[PDB]
Amino acid sequence: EIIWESLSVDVGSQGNPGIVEYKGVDTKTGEVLFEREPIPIGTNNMGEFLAIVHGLRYLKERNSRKPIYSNSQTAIKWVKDKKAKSTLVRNEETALIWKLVDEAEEWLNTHTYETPILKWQTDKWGEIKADY
RNA sequence: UCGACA
DNA sequence: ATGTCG
Ligand SMILES: [Mg+2]
Ligand SMILES: [Mg+2]
């Protein structure tokens, strides 16, 4: 019951909080469709969030109706709420990731999308295809 | 007091 | 170890 005609997204980090990146892959072929340059400090959930929103923008710009898979219950709820409820301290260190988070929320609040955001079922299907 | 997703 | 929600 994997919807193979989909985009899969994931975060990778070194530390948490720590250096965060993310990418999106074609679920069928594994081809890397986008990959964000590493952000010096962020959280896992911030990156999972940014990855979904990036995915929405990617698909919207390309007139694609493909769903997005994420394994993150947290990020899926933050996107649905249009609100990233991160605990990470907002200070000079974390300014870049908070800026990105702010700009993602703002995109969600200025655009429509129909993309279904689906939970990847890691316990049945193994690791999401975007995994680092 | 946990249970779960990362 | 930490970041998050139910
Ligand atoms: Mg993940
Ligand atoms: Mg993962």
Structural summary, described in words:
With 132 residues, this protein is of the alpha/beta class. It is globular, with a radius of gyration of 14 Å. It has helices at 44-61, 73-81, 95-108, 122-125, and strands spanning 7-15, 18-26, 32-42, 68-70, 117-119. The protein has a five-stranded mixed beta sheet, with helices on one face. Helices cover 34% and strands 27% of the residues. It has a single domain (1-132), classed as Ribonuclease H-like superfamily/Ribonuclease H (Nucleotidyltransferase, domain 5, 2-Layer Sandwich), CATH 3.30.420. It starts with 6 loop residues before the first strand and ends in a 7-residue tail after the last helix. The chain binds magnesium ion (MG) (2 copies). The structure holds a DNA/RNA duplex (6 and 6 nucleotides). The PDB classes it as hydrolase / rna / dna. The entry lists the keywords HYDROLASE - RNA - DNA complex. The assembly is trimeric.
